[PDB]
């Protein structure tokens, strides 16, 4: 429950501002990269190179509290099991953008 506060920091997500929302995925890298060969769907931005994971994945939702303030960025850590949706690109075809989870 202090996870998001550490994680946002170790991953340089609180460098100049506090990243409001951020999602971390706890599956193997291999499983997450495999999503690129799963259900093809529209990205929020309108491109058509997003994919949704056939399976729910173990994830963690990091959202800043209403009271948080740089440099002491504060986060609510919510764990969840959800289908993720990533944009894939390049060779190897791998995720390059987290898009959403359902």
């Amino acid at each position: 429950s202090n996870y998001c506060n550490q994680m946002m920091k170790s991953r340089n997500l609180t460098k100049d501002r506090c990243k409001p929302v951020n999602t971390f995925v706890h599956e193997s890298l291999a499983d997450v990269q495999a999503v690129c060969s799963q259900k093809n769907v529209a990205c929020k931005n309108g491109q058509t190179n997003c994919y949704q994971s056939y399976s729910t994945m173990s994830i963690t939702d990091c959202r800043e509290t209403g009271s948080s303030k740089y440099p002491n960025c504060a986060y609510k850590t919510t764990q969840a099991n959800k289908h993720i949706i990533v944009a894939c690109e390049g060779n190897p075809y791998v995720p390059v953008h987290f898009d959403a989870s359902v």
Partner: peptide, 15 residues
């Protein structure tokens, strides 16, 4: 400048 794939791991991967 960090390959977009690296960025995604730094940002969303905690295996």
């Amino acid at each position: 400048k960090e390959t977009a794939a690296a960025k995604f791991e730094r940002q969303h991967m905690d295996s």
